[PDB]
Design a protein around this nucleic acid. Structure first.
Ligand SMILES: Nc1ncnc2c1ncn2[C@@H]1O[C@H](COP(=O)(O)OP(=O)(O)O)[C@@H](O)[C@H]1O
Lengths: 99, 580, 100, 81, 111, 88, 100, 97, 111
DNA sequence: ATCAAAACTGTGCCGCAGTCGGCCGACCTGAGGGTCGCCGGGGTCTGCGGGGGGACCCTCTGGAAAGTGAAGGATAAGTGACGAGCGGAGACGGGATGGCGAACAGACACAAACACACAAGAGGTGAATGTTAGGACTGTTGCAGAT
DNA sequence: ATCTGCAACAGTCCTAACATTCACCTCTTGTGTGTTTGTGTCTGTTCGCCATCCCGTCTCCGCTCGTCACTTATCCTTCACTTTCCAGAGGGTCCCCCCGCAGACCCCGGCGACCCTCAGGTCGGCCGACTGCGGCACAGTTTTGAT
């Protein structure tokens, strides 16, 4: 069947369901391997409490959700719909984190 | 006794002014007595007392002191000063470098007198643009000049110009701005350069404060610092009624005369010209009203006993209500003024009692002020009732200032009450055509007296001056009046000192000193609303009496409503305890 | 468990449960939300007492009083929260001082 | 542990952007957000391992992560104190 | 001797003024700690906790729930403007965001 | 009669168009629209309101009526806007 | 000699160079003092100030407005423009945190 | 009026300046700025060491807490050199007297 | 008899900041209950390092401008050109300081 | 692809606040020398929980293929901001005139710390006791995409 | 206007996550009485700021206006994005092991707090006072705007 939605409908329904839900969105084991690698840069034989890894995950995902909110504002300001690397760099410059 | 000690000070260091290029000793040790003027003074004769003051100042030059000419308004300081200048030019052959200093409101008049009375002396002015100042800068850096006119302001603004020249003899005018020892102009003149011969010139004695000290005892003579730095308050210890001030410190007052012998000259206007007839001074007592009473006496309680420094605002409660404009939003919030809303101040009720009869009897009136908003709201009434007037203040831009005298001194000048300010004008009004000078609020000075009277007391006052110094019952205006008047007629002693600091009738320094100490001992005697008395103290002759009684009949056949407004009710509770 | 003295650590949990049963008689709270209310109470406590410490060192006192805590409330809390918080604090300290 | 940053899968970043409210995404967002996430984690984990190395432990804990986040500026409620 | 009066009961509060007083005492905030200051502070804290829990319970009423969850606290906080200003730099864990869509991203009403 | 104080130029609009342009051209701006003036004036108004209500609170706590340099510096320090130079 | 007017932009660029090259104050002292005293009059009606208090507020507010125009210049250049408008002053304050 | 001594790091900033640039003077208001800078970094490092004391349940601010406060506050290369300077001076202080 | 009241603790470590004043400020500043005898030496050496780094970088900014007196413009240029000093003083506004000569690339017309 | 017209930029000189070096006053704070509670640190034990390995199962990622719809470049009408000139005008110095508030020095009763006694309030456990959200399992309408 | 496809509700269903007692341990907070020092109260001095006006001297802000470089609306093309489907695979869950290790006691010296002197490093006004430096003045490049 040629029942393919035009782009925009499925995008809005994922906007609705992922703002209505509350769970984590990055997979727990690859996030954990990421954290243990980055911490292995700084110290050899560390050990991670699971609440420490999940605290890192809550912090990182609230950070990236807020950053994409500001990139959505910058992309709408530039008369676009598509977010781009130039406005990720813009929000991380106006916010303070880079320059 | 330290007068002989100051005589020893001046006897020790009286040699500096003749090396560096008794007080009956110091004013009489050298003499030269020529009553004849110098030859090149053109354009009118000298009076003999002008020659007396000139000869005294020539002796001040030859005693090499630093003199003070301090006589009264309208007695010719200018011609005496330029006569000194031309006598010191030709008859001594030193040919400057001369400096002078005037206020800018008189520099045209001083340059006019420099043209008319000494054409041999070239006169540089300093005004206008930096272009004109740069042209005369390049002119003066070579040394081709005799007289350098400049104002107060270009001394500091041309520091380098008038400091690289070794000055000889400055003569500066209007010394009651030169008084302040921490005035920046005074600091630049003291740390300017050692200029040799300096003269204050003034029309007033010490004012506003303590005796003469900070102008004449300090700036005019530098050695008096070395002889005064601890004894200043010791001489100032006269600063309660009979024993201290009158009985035992009469010797101290005589010692102040004794130390101010050789330096002043205050010849009174009563002696020689005397063309001023008189000054009929009365006081008039206004009152509160339904808001200025217990309504505002509630606000003394519920504020202090909000606005900062209420002593300033307590002037505003007795001048006029709703100059705050917040209570206008409760009494007349409909923003339209009429009868018995403007008029509610008791001073203003006294105005529209007294003013229509001088409109009838034809008294031309000057009115002075502080607090220019009172001038504005009086002007609002003055367009309300529509009687003719003008207005002058610190917003006349100097051209309308020089213009407006032609409007008021017309023979058909239908404008009668010329509203003024007490500060505004700077001794340039020159107005003889009034005969009634009322005063709303007394200042912190007798300069209100010694200027606002002299505006109408010029050469040509051909009526009697009727003064109505307003006051209100038990407001702060009375403590302003008694404070300024009593403890700033310290110069009752000095206005007595003028005659024996002048021509010197020998009985003036004891007998009439006692006769004015009579006025200094009727303190408690002088310290302790009816149409008859108030309408006679403005009256002059009997046709005025008949027409004032006729105007009383004409506003008695008319049924006055009442006097003013009564205490309306809920806004009286609302203005005080609901502000915050 | 064999006796090893499980170490006591305090919280605000019973007190938050008291206040919840005041303002809602019929609503339970979750465990994770109890931990969020606990960390919130510690956070607001540490902010207010840190600001009162800075006022004590600025004015060169050496004593935290009701006035330094009142001024820390007026600094940290916005608007209508600051108004009702000052009202509650002054009411409780006068009910403390007067009554007993 | 070789190049684990690509364990942040492409639909994971697309899901975080859908929570953020992004309707439509570029194709160069992916390496860029992986760089952004790596910088943020390097800062937080450097500060939390500083707290742990001071405490003479050999274990990152929930309190160390919370303290690192708090002194960075990102306060985190729900993991004790 | 009396029996006992907790200082919380004297002031009419719910929070532990004794625990507040020892925390102000040995948290190194100043040397001397007054005796009305822990009462004032416990009052402030009881107010803020009552406010947060009231708004969270109202949101749990709105979602037919009788157990108050971190989503409910997030909704209460970020929907009240003043608590949003206070908790501006704060990540309530298991929060999610406010349900919010921009107005450009809606589909074309005419097509 | 102009007896009210309704007729005078208001004090917030006294922050002039060329002074806003000098802060802009110091900031780096090359070309400025015409509604920047009202917007920057509103921004400055709100920022001064925050700092001056903190400085009034510090002053009233210290029991005085003279807002001082150290009070404004402490207010900016808790705004996050730390200022050197004036707080010794 | 009257037809020597610069291409529009050139005077703006030499203004940019002189005002970044110098370090004075740019808002003038008397009207900024009157604005400070007015806004303080909205809180405590009877204050007094200090010359260094008003100069501290002026240093703070001018450095704030310069940082705001740097960030609004970045936002305007991002929007393929040169002329800054109000919508990106509001964007700079929305992203930075000062608005919402 | 018993002129009240208000002390600062003015002469100490001056000593350091005359070490690292022997022919340069410093203005008055730049001396006020360097004073405020030293007091600012003092308050930050002392606040972080106090926080470390309360986090370990330990009552004493020592060199270990100041070292961790420097590593938590300073960026990168400044952190590494400042920790080196401090350990240098504490070994010279403990060894010599 | 006092033995030798000399050799202040600044002189033993060879520092130039007052170890005595730093110890007194740490002690009565009420940061913690008690203060070791090496912590203000360590801290004073750290503050010597930071003052030395900024004053050296500002000396080399008051040499380009041909001016042997450090005014606040020079401290602004030194601080905001060293990137680590810029990240340490990121929120700080050095008074009477001015900003850096930054003109964006798209602004200045060349084509 | 050359010249008029302004605009910085050196030099240089000349007064001017303003660093700065002593001067000693003149202290008030730091160093040293003793005493002694007390806290931190070395050392042992021991549950405990984090690393790791493995089995299994399945939802969720990778990859490609088709359509298509916004991104971007080119174009042009429109207007709004910029450079410049000119004439009022308000900042800026300086003044007058009191008046007050804040910083700075002694005396002192509220008040907060100390330190014991003791009981009762608050954690830790547990154990039913419900119970309440969660999780498949289906009925049933509201938005979307060619009809 | 009608198939159709996620998505919100309607009513069971294990289970697990809270909420009540419970006795209970313990440590922690009132209660109450010596006690001492930090905070306030008033008296005097000084100096900087406030409510009002003045009086000049200017750079500088406001208004007009000509002119053009910009912002924005339209259109066309095109490629980078979404949507769908479908094969596979690592993430999730359970469970088991298995030692490093965090934390709790225990005991004992170093060490920092407190105190008491007492000499001198630091502030700090004067006292010039030297000079580094802004503000005019004069030649000389050095870009821009026409051409
Ligand atoms: N000998 C004289 N003959 C005529 N007029 C004279 C003579 N001496 C002085 N005057 C008048 O004095 C006036 C100048 O006086 P002035 O110096 O202004 O007095 P004051 O300083 O007291 O106001 C001149 O206008 C002039 O008319």
């Amino acid at each position: 069947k040629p029942h393919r939605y035009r782009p925009g409908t499925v995008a809005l329904r994922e906007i609705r369901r992922y703002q209505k839900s509350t769970e984590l969105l990055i997979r727990k084991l690859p996030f954990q391997r990421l954290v243990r690698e980055i911490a292995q840069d700084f110290k050899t034989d560390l050990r991670f409490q699971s609440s420490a890894v999940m605290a890192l995950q809550e912090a990182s995902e609230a950070y990236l959700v807020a950053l994409f909110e500001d990139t959505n504002l910058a992309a709408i300001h530039a008369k676009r719909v598509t977010i781009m690397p130039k406005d990720i760099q813009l929000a991380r410059r106006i916010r303070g984190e880079r320059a | 006794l330290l007068d002989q000690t100051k005589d020893t000070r001046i006897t020790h260091l009286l040699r500096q002014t003749n090396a560096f290029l008794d007080y009956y000793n110091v004013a009489h040790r050298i003499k030269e007595d020529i009553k004849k003027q110098p030859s090149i003074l053109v354009g009118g004769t000298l009076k003999d007392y002008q020659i007396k003051g000139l000869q005294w100042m020539v002796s001040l030059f030859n005693n090499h002191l630093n003199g003070i000419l301090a006589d009264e308004m309208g007695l010719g300081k200018t011609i005496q000063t330029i006569s000194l200048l031309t006598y010191l030019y030709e008859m001594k052959n030193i040919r400057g470098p001369y400096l002078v200093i005037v206020p800018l409101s008189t520099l045209s008049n001083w340059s006019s007198e420099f043209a008319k009375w000494a054409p041999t002396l070239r006169t540089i002015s300093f005004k206008g643009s930096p272009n004109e100042r740069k042209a005369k800068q390049a002119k003066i850096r070579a040394g081709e000049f005799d007289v350098v006119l400049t104002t107060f302001e270009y001394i500091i603004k041309e520091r380098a110009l008038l400091s690289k020249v070794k000055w000889v003899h400055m003569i500066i005018d209007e010394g009651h701005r030169m008084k302040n020892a921490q005035s920046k102009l005074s600091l630049t003149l003291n740390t300017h350069y050692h200029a040799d011969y300096r003269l204050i010139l003034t029309g007033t004695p010490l004012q506003n404060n303590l005796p003469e000290l900070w102008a004449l005892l300090n700036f005019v003579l530098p050695k008096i610092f070395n002889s005064v730095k601890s004894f200043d308050e010791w001489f100032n210890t006269p600063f309660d009624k009979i024993e201290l001030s009158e009985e035992e410190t009469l010797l101290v007052i005589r010692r102040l005369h004794k130390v101010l012998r050789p330096f002043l000259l205050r010849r009174l206007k009563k002696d020689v010209e005397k063309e001023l007839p008189d000054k009929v001074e009365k006081v008039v007592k206004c009152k509160m009203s339904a808001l200025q009473q217990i309504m505002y006496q509630q606000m003394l309680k519920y504020r202090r006993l909000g606005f900062n420094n209420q002593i300033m605002q307590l002037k505003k409660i007795c001048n006029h209500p709703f100059v705050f404009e917040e209570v206008e939003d409760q009494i007349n919030p409909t923003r339209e003024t009429n009868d018995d809303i403007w008029r509610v101040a008791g001073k203003f009720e006294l105005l529209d009692r007294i003013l229509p009869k001088l409109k009838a009897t034809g008294h031309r009136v000057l009115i002075f002020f502080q607090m220019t908003q009172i001038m504005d709201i009086m002007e609002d009434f003055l367009r309300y009732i529509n009687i003719k007037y003008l207005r002058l203040d610190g917003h006349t831009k100097s051209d309308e200032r020089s213009e407006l005298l032609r409007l008021f001194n017309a023979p058909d000048s239908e404008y009668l009450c010329f509203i003024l300010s007490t500060r505004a004008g700077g001794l340039g009004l020159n107005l003889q055509t009034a005969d009634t000078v009322i005063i709303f609020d007394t200042d912190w000075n007798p300069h209100q007296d010694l200027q606002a009277q002299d505006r109408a007391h010029r050469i040509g006052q051909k009526n009697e001056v009727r003064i109505l110094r307003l006051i209100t019952t038990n407001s702060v205006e009375e403590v302003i009046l008694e404070r300024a008047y009593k403890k700033l007629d310290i110069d009752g002693k000095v206005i007595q000192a003028g005659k024996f600091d002048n021509k010197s009738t020998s009985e003036e320094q004891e007998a009439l000193l006692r006769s004015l100490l009579d006025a200094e001992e009727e303190r408690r005697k002088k310290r302790e609303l009816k149409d008859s008395e108030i309408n006679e103290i403005l009256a002059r002759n009997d046709e005025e009496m008949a027409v004032l009684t006729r105007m009383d009949e004409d506003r008695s056949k008319k049924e006055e409503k009442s006097r003013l407004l009564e205490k309306k009710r809920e806004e009286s509770e609302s203005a005080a305890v609901y502000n915050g | 468990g064999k006796k090893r003295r499980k170490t006591r650590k305090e919280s605000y949990a019973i007190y938050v449960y008291k206040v919840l049963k005041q303002v809602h008689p019929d609503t339970g709270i979750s465990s994770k939300a109890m931990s969020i209310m606990n960390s919130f109470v510690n956070d607001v406590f540490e902010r207010i007492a840190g600001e009162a410490s800075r006022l004590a060192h600025y004015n060169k006192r050496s004593t935290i009083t009701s006035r330094e805590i009142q001024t820390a409330v007026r600094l940290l809390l916005p608007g209508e929260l600051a108004k009702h918080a000052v009202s509650e604090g002054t009411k409780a300290v006068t009910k403390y001082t007067s009554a007993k | 542990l070789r190049d684990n940053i690509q364990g942040i899968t492409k639909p994971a970043i697309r899901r975080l952007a859908r929570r953020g409210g992004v309707k439509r995404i570029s194709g160069l967002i992916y390496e860029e957000t992986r760089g952004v996430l790596k910088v943020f984690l390097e800062n937080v984990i450097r500060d939390a391992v500083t707290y742990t190395e001071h405490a003479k432990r050999k274990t990152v804990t929930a309190m160390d992560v919370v303290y690192a986040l708090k002194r960075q500026g990102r306060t985190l409620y729900g993991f004790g104190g | 001797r009396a029996k006992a009066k907790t200082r919380s009961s004297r002031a009419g509060l719910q929070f532990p003024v004794g625990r507040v007083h020892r925390l102000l005492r040995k948290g190194n905030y100043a040397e001397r700690v007054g005796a009305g200051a822990p009462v004032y502070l416990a009052a402030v804290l009881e107010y803020l906790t009552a406010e947060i829990l009231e708004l969270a319970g109202n949101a749990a009423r709105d979602n037919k729930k009788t157990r108050i969850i971190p989503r409910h606290l997030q909704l209460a906080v970020r929907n009240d403007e003043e608590l949003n200003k206070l908790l501006g730099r704060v990540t309530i864990a298991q929060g999610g965001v406010l349900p919010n869509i921009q107005s450009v991203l809606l589909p074309k009403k005419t097509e």
